[PDB]
mmCIF file of N, CA, C and O in Angstrom:
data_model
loop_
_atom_site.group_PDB
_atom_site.id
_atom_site.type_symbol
_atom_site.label_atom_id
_atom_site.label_comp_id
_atom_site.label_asym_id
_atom_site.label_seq_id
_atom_site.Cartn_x
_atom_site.Cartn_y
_atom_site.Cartn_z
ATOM 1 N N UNK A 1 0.872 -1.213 0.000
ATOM 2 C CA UNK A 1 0.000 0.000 0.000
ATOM 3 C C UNK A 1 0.896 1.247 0.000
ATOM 4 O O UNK A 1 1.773 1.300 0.862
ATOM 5 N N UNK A 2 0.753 2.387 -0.989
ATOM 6 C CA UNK A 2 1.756 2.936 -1.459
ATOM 7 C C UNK A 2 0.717 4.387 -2.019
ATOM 8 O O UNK A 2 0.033 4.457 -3.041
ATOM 9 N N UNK A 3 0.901 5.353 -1.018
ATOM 10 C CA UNK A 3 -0.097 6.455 -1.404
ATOM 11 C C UNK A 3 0.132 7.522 -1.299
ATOM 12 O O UNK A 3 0.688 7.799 -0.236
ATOM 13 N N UNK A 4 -0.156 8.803 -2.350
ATOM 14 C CA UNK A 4 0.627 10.227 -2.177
ATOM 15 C C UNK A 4 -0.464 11.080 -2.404
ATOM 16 O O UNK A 4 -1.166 10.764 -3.364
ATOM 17 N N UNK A 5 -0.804 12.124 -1.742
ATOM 18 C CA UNK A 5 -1.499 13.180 -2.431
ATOM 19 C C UNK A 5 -0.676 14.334 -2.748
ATOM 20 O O UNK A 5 -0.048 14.742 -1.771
ATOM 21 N N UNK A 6 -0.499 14.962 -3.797
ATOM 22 C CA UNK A 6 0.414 16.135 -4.516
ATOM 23 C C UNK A 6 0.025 17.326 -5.101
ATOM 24 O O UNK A 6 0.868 18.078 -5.591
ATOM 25 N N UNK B 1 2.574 -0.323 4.518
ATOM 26 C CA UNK B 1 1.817 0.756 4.147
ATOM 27 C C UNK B 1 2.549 2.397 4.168
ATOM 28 O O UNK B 1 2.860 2.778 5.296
ATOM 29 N N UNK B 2 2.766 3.135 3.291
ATOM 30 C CA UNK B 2 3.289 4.249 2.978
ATOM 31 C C UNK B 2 2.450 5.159 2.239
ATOM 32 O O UNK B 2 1.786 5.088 1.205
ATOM 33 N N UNK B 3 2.710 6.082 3.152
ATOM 34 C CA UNK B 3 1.540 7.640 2.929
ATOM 35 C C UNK B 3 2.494 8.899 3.160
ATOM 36 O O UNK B 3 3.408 9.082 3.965
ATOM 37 N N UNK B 4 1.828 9.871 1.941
ATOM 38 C CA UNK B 4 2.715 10.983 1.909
ATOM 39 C C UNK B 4 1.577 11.601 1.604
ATOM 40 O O UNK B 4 0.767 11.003 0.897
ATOM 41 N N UNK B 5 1.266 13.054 2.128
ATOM 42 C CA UNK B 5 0.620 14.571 1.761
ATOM 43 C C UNK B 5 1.500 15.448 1.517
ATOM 44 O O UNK B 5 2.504 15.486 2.228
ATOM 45 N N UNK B 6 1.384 16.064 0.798
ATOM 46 C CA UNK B 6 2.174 17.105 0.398
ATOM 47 C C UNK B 6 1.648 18.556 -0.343
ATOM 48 O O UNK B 6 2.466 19.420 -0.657
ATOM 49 N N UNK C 1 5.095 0.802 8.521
ATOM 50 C CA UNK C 1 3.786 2.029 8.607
ATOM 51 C C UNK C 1 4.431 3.350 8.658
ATOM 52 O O UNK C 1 4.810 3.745 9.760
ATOM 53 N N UNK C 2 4.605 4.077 7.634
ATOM 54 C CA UNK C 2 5.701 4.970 7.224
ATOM 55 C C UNK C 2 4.250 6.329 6.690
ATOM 56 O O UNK C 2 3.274 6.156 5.961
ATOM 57 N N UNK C 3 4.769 7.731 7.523
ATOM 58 C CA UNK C 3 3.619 8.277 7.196
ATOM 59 C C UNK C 3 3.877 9.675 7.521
ATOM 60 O O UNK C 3 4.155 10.087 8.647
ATOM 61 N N UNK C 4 3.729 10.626 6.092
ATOM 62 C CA UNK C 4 4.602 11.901 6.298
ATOM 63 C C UNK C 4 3.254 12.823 6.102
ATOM 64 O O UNK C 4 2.444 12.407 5.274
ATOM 65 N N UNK C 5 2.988 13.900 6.715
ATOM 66 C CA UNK C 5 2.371 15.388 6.523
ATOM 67 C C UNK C 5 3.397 16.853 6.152
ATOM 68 O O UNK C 5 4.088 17.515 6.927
ATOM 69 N N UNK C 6 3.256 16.957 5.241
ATOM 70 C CA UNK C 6 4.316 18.114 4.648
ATOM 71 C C UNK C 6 3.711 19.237 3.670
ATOM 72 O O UNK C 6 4.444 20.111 3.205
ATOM 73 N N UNK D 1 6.684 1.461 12.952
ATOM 74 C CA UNK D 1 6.193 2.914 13.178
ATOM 75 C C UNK D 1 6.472 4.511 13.052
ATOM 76 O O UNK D 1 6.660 5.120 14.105
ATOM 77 N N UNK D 2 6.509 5.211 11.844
ATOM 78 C CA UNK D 2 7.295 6.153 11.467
ATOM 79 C C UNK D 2 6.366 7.075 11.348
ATOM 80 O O UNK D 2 5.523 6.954 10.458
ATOM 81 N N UNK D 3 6.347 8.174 12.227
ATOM 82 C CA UNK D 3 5.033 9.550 12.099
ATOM 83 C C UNK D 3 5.832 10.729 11.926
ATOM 84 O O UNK D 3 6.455 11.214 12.870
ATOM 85 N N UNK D 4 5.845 11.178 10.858
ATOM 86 C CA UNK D 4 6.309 13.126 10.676
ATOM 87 C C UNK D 4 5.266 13.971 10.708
ATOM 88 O O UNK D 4 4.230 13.362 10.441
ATOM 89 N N UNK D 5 5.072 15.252 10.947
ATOM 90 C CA UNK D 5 4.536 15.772 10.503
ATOM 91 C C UNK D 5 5.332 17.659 10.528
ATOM 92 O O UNK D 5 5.482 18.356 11.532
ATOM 93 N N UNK D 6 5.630 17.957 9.338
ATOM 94 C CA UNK D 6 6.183 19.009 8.746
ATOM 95 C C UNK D 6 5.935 20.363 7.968
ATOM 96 O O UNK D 6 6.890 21.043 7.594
ATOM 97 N N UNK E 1 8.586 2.820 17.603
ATOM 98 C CA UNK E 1 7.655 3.641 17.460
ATOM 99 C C UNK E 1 8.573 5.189 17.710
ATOM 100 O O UNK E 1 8.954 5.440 18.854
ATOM 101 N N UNK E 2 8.992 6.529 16.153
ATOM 102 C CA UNK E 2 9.553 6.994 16.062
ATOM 103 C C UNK E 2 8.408 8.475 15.437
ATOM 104 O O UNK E 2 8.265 8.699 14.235
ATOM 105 N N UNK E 3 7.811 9.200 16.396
ATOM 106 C CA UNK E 3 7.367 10.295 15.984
ATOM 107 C C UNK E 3 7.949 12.177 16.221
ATOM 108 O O UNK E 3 8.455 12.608 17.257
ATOM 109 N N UNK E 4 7.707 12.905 15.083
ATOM 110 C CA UNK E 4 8.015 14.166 15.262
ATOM 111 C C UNK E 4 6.891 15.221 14.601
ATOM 112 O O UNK E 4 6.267 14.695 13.679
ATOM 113 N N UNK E 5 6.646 16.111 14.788
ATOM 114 C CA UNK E 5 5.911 17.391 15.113
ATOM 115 C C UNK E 5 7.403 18.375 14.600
ATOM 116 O O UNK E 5 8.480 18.276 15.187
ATOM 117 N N UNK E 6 7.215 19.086 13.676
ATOM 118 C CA UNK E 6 8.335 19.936 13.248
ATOM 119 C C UNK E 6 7.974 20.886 12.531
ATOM 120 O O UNK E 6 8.806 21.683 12.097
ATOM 121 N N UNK F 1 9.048 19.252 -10.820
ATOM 122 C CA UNK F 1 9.673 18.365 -10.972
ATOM 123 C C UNK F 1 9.356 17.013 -10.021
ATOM 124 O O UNK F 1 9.419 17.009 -8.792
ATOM 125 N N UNK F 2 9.010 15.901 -10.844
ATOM 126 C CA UNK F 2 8.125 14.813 -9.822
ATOM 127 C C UNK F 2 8.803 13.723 -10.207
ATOM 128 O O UNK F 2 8.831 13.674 -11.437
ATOM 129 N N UNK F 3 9.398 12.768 -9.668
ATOM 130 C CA UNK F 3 10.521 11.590 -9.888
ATOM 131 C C UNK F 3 9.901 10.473 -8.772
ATOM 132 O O UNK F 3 9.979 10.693 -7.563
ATOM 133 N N UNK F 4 9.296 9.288 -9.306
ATOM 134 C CA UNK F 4 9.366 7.990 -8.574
ATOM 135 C C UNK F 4 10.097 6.797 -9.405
ATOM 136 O O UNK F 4 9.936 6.343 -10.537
ATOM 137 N N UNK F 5 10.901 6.521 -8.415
ATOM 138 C CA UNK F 5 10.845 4.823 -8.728
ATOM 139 C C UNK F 5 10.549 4.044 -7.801
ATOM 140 O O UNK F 5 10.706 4.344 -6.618
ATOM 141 N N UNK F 6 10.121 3.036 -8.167
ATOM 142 C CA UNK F 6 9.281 2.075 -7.360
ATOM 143 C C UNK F 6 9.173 0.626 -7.869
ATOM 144 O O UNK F 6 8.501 -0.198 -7.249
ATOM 145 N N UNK G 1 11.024 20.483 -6.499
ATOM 146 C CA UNK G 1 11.642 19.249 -6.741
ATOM 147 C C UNK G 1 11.006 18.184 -5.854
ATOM 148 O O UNK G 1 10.861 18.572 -4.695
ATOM 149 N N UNK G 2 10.545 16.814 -6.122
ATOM 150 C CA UNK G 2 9.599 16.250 -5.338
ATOM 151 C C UNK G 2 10.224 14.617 -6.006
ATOM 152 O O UNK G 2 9.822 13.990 -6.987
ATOM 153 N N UNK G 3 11.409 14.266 -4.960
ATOM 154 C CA UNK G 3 11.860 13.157 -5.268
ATOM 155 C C UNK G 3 11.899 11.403 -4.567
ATOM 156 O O UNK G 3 12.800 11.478 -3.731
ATOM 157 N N UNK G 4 11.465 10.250 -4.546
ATOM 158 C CA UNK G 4 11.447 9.367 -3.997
ATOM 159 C C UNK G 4 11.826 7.783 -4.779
ATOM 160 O O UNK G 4 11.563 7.526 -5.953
ATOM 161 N N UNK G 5 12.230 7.218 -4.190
ATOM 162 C CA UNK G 5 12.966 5.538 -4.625
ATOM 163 C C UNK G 5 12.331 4.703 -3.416
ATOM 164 O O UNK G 5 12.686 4.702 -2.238
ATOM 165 N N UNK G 6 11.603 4.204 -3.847
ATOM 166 C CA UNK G 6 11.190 2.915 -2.908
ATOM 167 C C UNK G 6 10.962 1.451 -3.475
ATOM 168 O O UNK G 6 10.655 0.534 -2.712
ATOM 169 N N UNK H 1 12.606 21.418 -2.277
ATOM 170 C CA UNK H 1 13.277 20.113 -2.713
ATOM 171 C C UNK H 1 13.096 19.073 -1.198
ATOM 172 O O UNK H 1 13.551 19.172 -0.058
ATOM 173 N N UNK H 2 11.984 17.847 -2.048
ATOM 174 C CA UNK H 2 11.905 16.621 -1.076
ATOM 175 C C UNK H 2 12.460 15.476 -1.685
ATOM 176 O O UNK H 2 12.168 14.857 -2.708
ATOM 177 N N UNK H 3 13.569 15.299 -0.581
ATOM 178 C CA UNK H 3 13.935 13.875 -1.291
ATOM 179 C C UNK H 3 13.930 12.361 -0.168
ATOM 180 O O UNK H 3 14.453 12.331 0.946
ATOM 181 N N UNK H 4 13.254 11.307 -0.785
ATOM 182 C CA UNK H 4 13.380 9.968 0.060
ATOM 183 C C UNK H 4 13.772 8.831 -0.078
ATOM 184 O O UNK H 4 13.140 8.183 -0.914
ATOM 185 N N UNK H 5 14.591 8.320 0.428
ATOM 186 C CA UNK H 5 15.125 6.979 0.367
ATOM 187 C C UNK H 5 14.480 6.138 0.976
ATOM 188 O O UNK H 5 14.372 6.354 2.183
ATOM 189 N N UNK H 6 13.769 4.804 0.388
ATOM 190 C CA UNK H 6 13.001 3.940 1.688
ATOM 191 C C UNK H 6 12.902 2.228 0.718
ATOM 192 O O UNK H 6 12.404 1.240 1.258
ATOM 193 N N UNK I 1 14.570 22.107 1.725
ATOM 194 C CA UNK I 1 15.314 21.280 1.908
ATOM 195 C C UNK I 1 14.889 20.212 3.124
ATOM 196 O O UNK I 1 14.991 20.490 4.319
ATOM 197 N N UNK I 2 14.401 18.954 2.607
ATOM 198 C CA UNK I 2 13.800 18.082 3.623
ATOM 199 C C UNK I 2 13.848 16.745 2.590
ATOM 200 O O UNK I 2 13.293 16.495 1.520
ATOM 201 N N UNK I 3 15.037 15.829 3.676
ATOM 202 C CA UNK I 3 15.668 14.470 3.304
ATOM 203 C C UNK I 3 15.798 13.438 4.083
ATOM 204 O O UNK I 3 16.317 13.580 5.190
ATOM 205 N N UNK I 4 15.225 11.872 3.524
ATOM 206 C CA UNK I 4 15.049 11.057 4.507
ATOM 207 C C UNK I 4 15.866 10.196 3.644
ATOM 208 O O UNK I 4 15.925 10.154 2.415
ATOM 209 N N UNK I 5 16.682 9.302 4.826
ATOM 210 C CA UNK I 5 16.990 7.525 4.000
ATOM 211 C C UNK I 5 16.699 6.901 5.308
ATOM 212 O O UNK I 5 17.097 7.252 6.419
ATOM 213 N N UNK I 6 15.678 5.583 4.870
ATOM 214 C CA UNK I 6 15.072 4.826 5.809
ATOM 215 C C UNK I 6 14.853 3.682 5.145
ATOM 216 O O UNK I 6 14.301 2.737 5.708
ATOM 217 N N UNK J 1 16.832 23.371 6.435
ATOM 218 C CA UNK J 1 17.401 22.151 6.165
ATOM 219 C C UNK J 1 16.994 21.053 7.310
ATOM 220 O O UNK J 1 17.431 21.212 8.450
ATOM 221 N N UNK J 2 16.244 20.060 7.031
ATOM 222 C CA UNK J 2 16.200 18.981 7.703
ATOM 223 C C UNK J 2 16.163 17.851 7.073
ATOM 224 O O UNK J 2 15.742 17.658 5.933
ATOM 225 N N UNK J 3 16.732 16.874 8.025
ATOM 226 C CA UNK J 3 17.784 15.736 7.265
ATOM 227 C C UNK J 3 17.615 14.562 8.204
ATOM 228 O O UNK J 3 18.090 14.586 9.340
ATOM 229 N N UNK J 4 16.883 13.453 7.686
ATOM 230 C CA UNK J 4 16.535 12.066 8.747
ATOM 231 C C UNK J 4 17.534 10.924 8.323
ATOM 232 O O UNK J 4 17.619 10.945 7.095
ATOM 233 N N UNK J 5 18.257 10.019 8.821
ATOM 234 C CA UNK J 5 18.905 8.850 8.924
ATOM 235 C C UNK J 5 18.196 7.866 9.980
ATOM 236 O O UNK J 5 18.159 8.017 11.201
ATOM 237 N N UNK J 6 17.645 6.824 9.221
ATOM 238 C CA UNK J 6 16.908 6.081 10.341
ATOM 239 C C UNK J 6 17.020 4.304 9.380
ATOM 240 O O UNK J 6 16.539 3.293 9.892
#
Protein backbone atom coordinates (compact mmCIF):
# COMPACT_ATOMS: atom_id res chain seq x y z
CA UNK A 1 0.00 0.00 0.00
CA UNK A 2 1.76 2.94 -1.46
CA UNK A 3 -0.10 6.46 -1.40
CA UNK A 4 0.63 10.23 -2.18
CA UNK A 5 -1.50 13.18 -2.43
CA UNK A 6 0.41 16.13 -4.52
CA UNK B 1 1.82 0.76 4.15
CA UNK B 2 3.29 4.25 2.98
CA UNK B 3 1.54 7.64 2.93
CA UNK B 4 2.71 10.98 1.91
CA UNK B 5 0.62 14.57 1.76
CA UNK B 6 2.17 17.10 0.40
CA UNK C 1 3.79 2.03 8.61
CA UNK C 2 5.70 4.97 7.22
CA UNK C 3 3.62 8.28 7.20
CA UNK C 4 4.60 11.90 6.30
CA UNK C 5 2.37 15.39 6.52
CA UNK C 6 4.32 18.11 4.65
CA UNK D 1 6.19 2.91 13.18
CA UNK D 2 7.30 6.15 11.47
CA UNK D 3 5.03 9.55 12.10
CA UNK D 4 6.31 13.13 10.68
CA UNK D 5 4.54 15.77 10.50
CA UNK D 6 6.18 19.01 8.75
CA UNK E 1 7.66 3.64 17.46
CA UNK E 2 9.55 6.99 16.06
CA UNK E 3 7.37 10.29 15.98
CA UNK E 4 8.02 14.17 15.26
CA UNK E 5 5.91 17.39 15.11
CA UNK E 6 8.34 19.94 13.25
CA UNK F 1 9.67 18.36 -10.97
CA UNK F 2 8.13 14.81 -9.82
CA UNK F 3 10.52 11.59 -9.89
CA UNK F 4 9.37 7.99 -8.57
CA UNK F 5 10.84 4.82 -8.73
CA UNK F 6 9.28 2.08 -7.36
CA UNK G 1 11.64 19.25 -6.74
CA UNK G 2 9.60 16.25 -5.34
CA UNK G 3 11.86 13.16 -5.27
CA UNK G 4 11.45 9.37 -4.00
CA UNK G 5 12.97 5.54 -4.63
CA UNK G 6 11.19 2.91 -2.91
CA UNK H 1 13.28 20.11 -2.71
CA UNK H 2 11.90 16.62 -1.08
CA UNK H 3 13.94 13.87 -1.29
CA UNK H 4 13.38 9.97 0.06
CA UNK H 5 15.12 6.98 0.37
CA UNK H 6 13.00 3.94 1.69
CA UNK I 1 15.31 21.28 1.91
CA UNK I 2 13.80 18.08 3.62
CA UNK I 3 15.67 14.47 3.30
CA UNK I 4 15.05 11.06 4.51
CA UNK I 5 16.99 7.53 4.00
CA UNK I 6 15.07 4.83 5.81
CA UNK J 1 17.40 22.15 6.16
CA UNK J 2 16.20 18.98 7.70
CA UNK J 3 17.78 15.74 7.27
CA UNK J 4 16.54 12.07 8.75
CA UNK J 5 18.90 8.85 8.92
CA UNK J 6 16.91 6.08 10.34
Amino acid sequence: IFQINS
